[PDB]
Amino acid sequence: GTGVLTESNKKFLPFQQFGRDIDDTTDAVRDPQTLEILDITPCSFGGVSV
Amino acid sequence: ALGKLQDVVNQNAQALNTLVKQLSSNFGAISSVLNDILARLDKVEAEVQIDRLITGRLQSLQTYVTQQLIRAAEIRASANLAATKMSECVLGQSKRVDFCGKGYHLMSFPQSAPHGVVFLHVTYVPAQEKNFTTAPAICHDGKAHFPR
Amino acid sequence: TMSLGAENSVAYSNNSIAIPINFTISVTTEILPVSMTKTSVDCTMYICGDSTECSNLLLQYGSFCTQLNRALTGIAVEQDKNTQEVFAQVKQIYKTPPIKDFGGFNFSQILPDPSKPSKRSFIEDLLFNKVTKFNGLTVLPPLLTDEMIAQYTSALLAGTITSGWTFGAGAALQIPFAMQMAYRFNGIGVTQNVLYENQKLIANQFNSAIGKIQDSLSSTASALGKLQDVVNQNAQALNTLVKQLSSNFGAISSVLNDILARLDKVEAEVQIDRLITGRLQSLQTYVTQQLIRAAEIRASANLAATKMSECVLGQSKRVDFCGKGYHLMSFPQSAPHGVVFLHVTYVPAQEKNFTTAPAICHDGKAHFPREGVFVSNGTHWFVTQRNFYEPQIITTHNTFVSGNCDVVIGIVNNTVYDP
Amino acid sequence: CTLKSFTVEKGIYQTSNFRVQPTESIVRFPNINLCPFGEVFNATRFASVYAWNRKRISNCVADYSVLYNSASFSTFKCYGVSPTKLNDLCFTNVYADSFVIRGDEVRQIAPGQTGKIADYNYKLPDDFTGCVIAWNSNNLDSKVGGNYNYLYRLFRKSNLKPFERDISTEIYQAGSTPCNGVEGFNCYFPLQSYGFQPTYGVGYQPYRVVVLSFELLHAPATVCGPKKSTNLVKNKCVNFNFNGLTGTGVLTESNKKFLPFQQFGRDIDDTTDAVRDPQTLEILDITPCSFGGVSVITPGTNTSNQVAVLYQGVNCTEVNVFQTRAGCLIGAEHVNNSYECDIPIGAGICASYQTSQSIIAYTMSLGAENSVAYSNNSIAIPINFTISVTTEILPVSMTKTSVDCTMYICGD
Amino acid sequence: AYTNSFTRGVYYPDKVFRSSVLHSTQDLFLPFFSNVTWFHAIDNPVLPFNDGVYFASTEKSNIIRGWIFGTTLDSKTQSLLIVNNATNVVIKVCEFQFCNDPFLGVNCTFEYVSFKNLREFVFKNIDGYFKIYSKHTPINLVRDLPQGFSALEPLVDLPIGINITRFQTLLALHAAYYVGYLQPRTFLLKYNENGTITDAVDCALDPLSETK
Ligand SMILES: *[C@@H]1O[C@H](CO)[C@@H](O[C@@H]2O[C@H](CO)[C@@H](O)[C@H](O)[C@H]2NC(C)=O)[C@H](O)[C@H]1NC(C)=O
Ligand SMILES: *[C@@H]1O[C@H](CO)[C@@H](O[C@@H]2O[C@H](CO)[C@@H](O)[C@H](O)[C@H]2NC(C)=O)[C@H](O)[C@H]1NC(C)=O
Ligand SMILES: *[C@@H]1O[C@H](CO)[C@@H](O[C@@H]2O[C@H](CO)[C@@H](O)[C@H](O)[C@H]2NC(C)=O)[C@H](O)[C@H]1NC(C)=O
Ligand SMILES: *[C@@H]1O[C@H](CO)[C@@H](O[C@@H]2O[C@H](CO)[C@@H](O)[C@H](O)[C@H]2NC(C)=O)[C@H](O)[C@H]1NC(C)=O
Ligand SMILES: *[C@@H]1O[C@H](CO)[C@@H](O[C@@H]2O[C@H](CO)[C@@H](O)[C@H](O)[C@H]2NC(C)=O)[C@H](O)[C@H]1NC(C)=O
Ligand SMILES: *[C@@H]1O[C@H](CO)[C@@H](O[C@@H]2O[C@H](CO)[C@@H](O)[C@H](O)[C@H]2NC(C)=O)[C@H](O)[C@H]1NC(C)=O
Ligand SMILES: *[C@@H]1O[C@H](CO)[C@@H](O[C@@H]2O[C@H](CO)[C@@H](O)[C@H](O)[C@H]2NC(C)=O)[C@H](O)[C@H]1NC(C)=O
Ligand SMILES: *[C@@H]1O[C@H](CO)[C@@H](O)[C@H](O)[C@H]1NC(C)=O
Ligand SMILES: *[C@@H]1O[C@H](CO)[C@@H](O)[C@H](O)[C@H]1NC(C)=O
Ligand SMILES: *[C@@H]1O[C@H](CO)[C@@H](O)[C@H](O)[C@H]1NC(C)=O
Ligand SMILES: *[C@@H]1O[C@H](CO)[C@@H](O)[C@H](O)[C@H]1NC(C)=O
Ligand SMILES: *[C@@H]1O[C@H](CO)[C@@H](O)[C@H](O)[C@H]1NC(C)=O
Ligand SMILES: *[C@@H]1O[C@H](CO)[C@@H](O)[C@H](O)[C@H]1NC(C)=O
Ligand SMILES: *[C@@H]1O[C@H](CO)[C@@H](O)[C@H](O)[C@H]1NC(C)=O
Ligand SMILES: *[C@@H]1O[C@H](CO)[C@@H](O)[C@H](O)[C@H]1NC(C)=O
Ligand SMILES: *[C@@H]1O[C@H](CO)[C@@H](O)[C@H](O)[C@H]1NC(C)=O
Ligand SMILES: *[C@@H]1O[C@H](CO)[C@@H](O)[C@H](O)[C@H]1NC(C)=O
Question: What cystine pairs are annotated (chain C)?
Fold first, then answer.
């Protein structure tokens, strides 16, 4: 994916590896090397126009 | 049930939730996640699958813009009616029956609301009928008199 | 090369006026569509013929199918709204007394007729006689049946005949019909004694004009053309949607069972997705054209609902809104998927030209008419109203003073009587 | 589940479609001859490929599994049909085209191909519907010293059209030389013999081909699979198969005057509306199995979880139970009165709740009836008034969305 | 000699029942108001077949009782022969050297058996299958074909797989007939309530027919 990662308060149950969005893509993750839970947010808040 | 404004919020929210849900669908590809096709199949193997996503994502975005052009035309028909009630009911006194509340119209006051307007139409309603005998004309000294 | 009309150099002059000596009551028929047939189409039953081997492919397009049923349901619900906005304007079901003592006017062709199994008027039965595939498709009934729409056009007319303007503004207040019509003459700027002095002639002109509506509607095929056109457009749109099921779209056949009965799954799915792709575009085209066509019917239902309120529940001052002339009154008749208005109108007739002047000099004062115009026939000067020639002796009652004889262009010398 | 909510407000909701499931499956075929494919596939000698032999196959029952199960065949490619399906199907006629060919050249016997056999010996239509069967025939068709009895066309003026055939031995012209009916510099005899010897490599050995062309039409079928007929059923929802025409519906006797040659009947919009039974010869009308919709009628769940159901456009015999003009309505206490509409159903029917513990359904009230007190000299005049404030709400704008079409479609 | 065909030569285009419908079809038809060739039986010249033939005759006791079709006709190629003797209809494809003008005296590749009136027939050979349609009617005009309408009904369909470019009728010997050629045309056909075709439009005849 691509975005801003921020460590977050979404308290996953021990079996859950991911949290998901309405298009089924990732909204949050657990790190493969740590019990840290990360929110994922889009760059520029979904791009922007000029 | 004062719902004409909340019904416009609901229709635009329901149209966007449908537009976002349409990204989860396969349209006949191996997957709905575009990165999981590119991360599994090598260029010309993947382009055949990605064109199914592009075709279905064009058709679902083009469906949304078409329905929004139609929803926008009825919001404009309502904004032309609200602009006409501002002119004829607020800035004046309407003689048009039921345009401007019911009863004979005296005044209106415009209140703002989320995505809309509210008119407090003030009207005179006649309220206690009594029966009387009546006549077209009065005969006096052989002259017919009619009321002004 | 087409002709735009007869050419007419109208006889303008700085001191000439024309005033009508006589009038015609005219009745003219306006027809508006108000709703259209409440179709629906089950997108799965249309596309896949209800075959599971196809339905499991159709799920790959997700929510594409439910939003076609959302659109057709919204179009179907607003047909009952459009029918309510027009007819359901009356709060109570008014009815006329058993005796028809309406001052010489004859409503028998306009009012209900309990000879009929549905209680439609004589003219409503002319209208209902002149207006004239089973797998995906479905036709829903309207909420109001024609027997209930005919009870509204009966109440919305028994109120008009017995009480005039008043049943729109509040509770119906009864008034004699010969007096109702006097205040409708008074509303177009014709002095009310013009009705009472001509009441037999005016009622004969009205009764004769309603008689000619029977003949126009009985004889002429194009008369209800606006309603028949709305019926024809929806039938032509359905015929196209159904004939598109026979289209091949690049499959081995257009018959879905005959693909499934010839090919094995991995070979059949490649053919069935061509039919799904074409049948989905065939249905999206229909629903888009119906969403646009339903907006044209709604814009006509909103017009019909305001002609109902302003023409039937009132006395309109808006030019050509309630028919061509100085509008007096209008009567609603139901029609298949529409409404018909009979617009009773005053039309001035038998014009005569007179000499006129802006003001009249007397004692060096200028006199102006309170109501109407000054005219002369040569030897004498008179006041008249504008829309019917009734000449009166000029007096200090029918005139008002301002200024003096030096100020006004085209002022003339005549004695003003002090009564 | 339709509304994606645990609470639902007062209304009528189209939740589901209803349709009658078929009860039984009916199979009908002519009572007709185990098919003479053996007289083609096991013939002693096959034709030369330039002069291929066509047999009409008709008036028979054919178990194609005798062909497609067998290990004896080197290739079984099939187009517009899948071979395991052939036992279920029926056809007007079948044409079996048969010849000997060199084994490498068999790849030319398919639609869309080009090369000297496809071009000048035997051309398929590119919209073929049929199967191509081929096998190595070395022990049948090769001989010591070479078998010269089998030939191919090397030359022609122009390519064959689909199923065109050409016997001519006249001298081909390969250049500007006028040949005048004799060989020479750029003038040659148009046919070549294969000369098959058993010493040859597999690509050079003789192969036998049979091509089956299926005459699939809505005309009466004379070739069919072995699939057995059932007895007939009437006035009931059934799945059916007449001569390979699969369908679903209700079968009923009808007055349709089929002329003696007519086999099927059709509607205004070109759907199949009737058939004649291949054994019985009775005319049967077909109508679809009943369907409509399942509009669920509810007060709000904040009032009650009690519910009524409208089988929309359906008749109650096909599903207290009440037949409305809008469809069959199911609930309790659907009782005779009139009220203003709470929940609409259609054709003047409406429904509403009683908290006596029930959903009413009734013909709607239009309003209170009122004979106005008219007489030709009576007027009513109001002695008093009321100043009334009426709230009217109007939409004016909607949220200014915008979408980046590239980022929506392609996600960067 | 020549005659106007009027609206003659319509036939049921397929084996499907239809009723109360205006169906449209593209097939080999005799064009409306086509110019068709008239022959007296006092001869049977060899005639071209083109794409197919409409044939009609009018004789007091049936003199026309068969036809030869093929390219050489004389059976030096597979030649189709049709004859009827008032007890049977007899049909053959043959290469045996039968006579060059085999009037009915008052390889067997295929074989099959089964002005007082106007007798009408249509012959066509799509996919090499020889199709015959016919009608008989009591109409008594001598010179021209009768202005009016009737639909020809399919009799026969022979899967002979064979080429034809010429034909010749056969006469009873010890009366007139008409010949016109089919062309690929679009028609609109009116199927009645009882499924009979009772009217038609030739969609390329004139601008009014193209409008219809
Ligand atoms: C009102 O108009 C109707 C219809 O024009 C008149 O009804 C006719 O009256 C005659 C009287 O002899 C009857 O014979 C007819 O049967 C009636 N109907 C028609 C259609 O002609 C009626 O007389 C008029 N006047 C009143 C007071 O109602
Ligand atoms: C005003 O016009 C009306 C017609 O609109 C005239 O009424 C007709 O007059 C003739 C001759 O007197 C009669 O035969 C008709 O029966 C009348 N028609 C009706 C419906 O009553 C009327 O005479 C004109 N009046 C003036 C003052 O010009
Ligand atoms: C009404 O119009 C007629 C027709 O124009 C007028 O008659 C003309 O009058 C003038 C004198 O004012 C003459 O010169 C013409 O010869 C007359 N005849 C025609 C045919 O124009 C008439 O005067 C007008 N009446 C009034 C009171 O203005
Ligand atoms: C139009 O002009 C005539 C002129 O004759 C006016 O009528 C005359 O009026 C005087 C005074 O009232 C009478 O003495 C005459 O006997 C009248 N003559 C006629 C022929 O009636 C007339 O008043 C004017 N027009 C109108 C509508 O009143
Ligand atoms: C109406 O128009 C006519 C001209 O068309 C005016 O008549 C003129 O009046 C002046 C008055 O001083 C005379 O000097 C001219 O000789 C007149 N000309 C003609 C041809 O008559 C008339 O005055 C105008 N009316 C008004 C009120 O201005
Ligand atoms: C209208 O009448 C007035 C008098 O009431 C006329 O004005 C007088 O005209 C004469 C002759 O030109 C003058 O001697 C007077 O001085 C004028 N004024 C007064 C107050 O007498 C006037 O000319 C007349 N106008 C018309 C158009 O008839
Ligand atoms: C006006 O007159 C009418 C008719 O006499 C009165 O209406 C009747 O009133 C009685 C008693 O309330 C009712 O039972 C009848 O049903 C009424 N008849 C009709 C035809 O409506 C009426 O009450 C009088 N007064 C007012 C204020 O309208
Ligand atoms: C390996 O991964 C585990 C995951 O729990 C982590 O605790 C540990 O520190 C990691 N060790 C190294 C050497 O990467
Ligand atoms: C051909 O011969 C074989 C010999 O075993 C026989 O079983 C088969 O039935 C015959 N017919 C076909 C079509 O193979
Ligand atoms: C089988 O064919 C004959 C042909 O005469 C037909 O009469 C018969 O009804 C058919 N058999 C059955 C069991 O229907
Ligand atoms: C449920 O019912 C109570 C009492 O009628 C009411 O206060 C509450 O707002 C209702 N809630 C909903 C979600 O309708
Ligand atoms: C309902 O179906 C039954 C059986 O088909 C029939 O007798 C009845 O007339 C039908 N009624 C309506 C109103 O459809
Ligand atoms: C039945 O209801 C109707 C209105 O739907 C009403 O007119 C009628 O009087 C009622 N019958 C009884 C016995 O109450
Ligand atoms: C038919 O066509 C031929 C062409 O030569 C012509 O001689 C003949 O007059 C035509 N007949 C009619 C009736 O037009
Ligand atoms: C039919 O035969 C003629 C020779 O009489 C020949 O020219 C033509 O090409 C043949 N057509 C076909 C389709 O074989
Ligand atoms: C039958 O066909 C063969 C081969 O085409 C030919 O030699 C023979 O002459 C034909 N029979 C007759 C009677 O001509
Ligand atoms: C159709 O059939 C009916 C019933 O046998 C018959 O009376 C009628 O004359 C026929 N009409 C036509 C146009 O064939």
Answer: 43-65, 48-54, 311-322, 361-405
- d(CA A34, ligand 8 centre) in Å: 7
Provide the experimental method for this PDB entry. cryo-EM
Three-state SS for D144-196 is CCCECCCEEECCCCCCCCCCCCCCCCCCEECCCCCCCCCCECCEECCEEECCE
Strands (E) located in C2-66: 16-33, 38-41
Which residues fall within 8 angstroms of residue C33, CB to CB, at 6 or more apart? C226, C227, C230, C297, C300, C301, C337, C338
Q: How many domains does chain E have?
A: 1
The secondary structure of residue E145, as a DSSP letter, is P
- Name every chain C residue with its beta carbon within 8 A of the beta carbon of D347: 141-143, 145
What is the span of the domain harbouring residue E176? Answer: 2-212
Q: Which residues of B touch A22 (CB under 8 A)?
A: 17, 20-21, 24
Q: Which atom of ligand 3 is the closest one to the Cα of C377?
A: 27
For D38, residues 6+ apart whose C-beta sits below 8 A from its C-beta are none
* Amino acid (1-letter code) at residue A28: A
Q: Residues C128, C135: contact at Cβ < 8 Å?
A: no
* B52 Cβ contact list (under 8 Å, min separation 6): B26, B27, B28, B29
Three-class DSSP category at B46: helix
The counts of H helices and E strands in chain E are 1, 18
Ligand closest to A30 (CA) is 8
Give me the DSSP letters along E177-212: EEEEE-EEEEEEEEE-TTS-EEEEEETTSSHHHHH-
- For chain C, the distance separating the N- and C-terminal CA atoms, rounded to the nearest angstrom, is 62
Tokens 């409208």, residue located: D310
Ligand 13 atom at minimum distance from D337 CA: 2
Interface contact flag, C288 B66, Cβ < 8 Å: yes
Going through D195-314 in order, the beta strands assigned E by DSSP cover: 206-214, 223-224, 237-242, 245-253, 264-266, 272-276, 283-287, 294-298, 308-312
Which residues lie with the beta carbon below 6 Å from any ligand 9 atom? D 37-38, 41-42, 66
Can you tell me which atom of ligand 9 is nearest the CA of D42? 1
3 state SS for B23-38: CCCCCCCCCCCHHHHH
The interaxial angle of helices C66-87 and C146-163, nearest 10 deg, is 30
Cα separations in angstroms, D34 against D38, D39, D62, D131: 10, 12, 6, 20
* Helix/strand/coil for D13: strand
Q: In this complex, which chains have at least 3 CB pairs below 8 Å with chain E?
A: D
**Domain CATH for E103:** 2.60.120.960
Query: In chain A, whose CA is at the least distance from the CA of B21?
Result: A23
Q: Which two tokens stand for residue D406?
A: 């590239």
Neighboring chains of C (3 or more beta-carbon pairs < 8 A): B, D
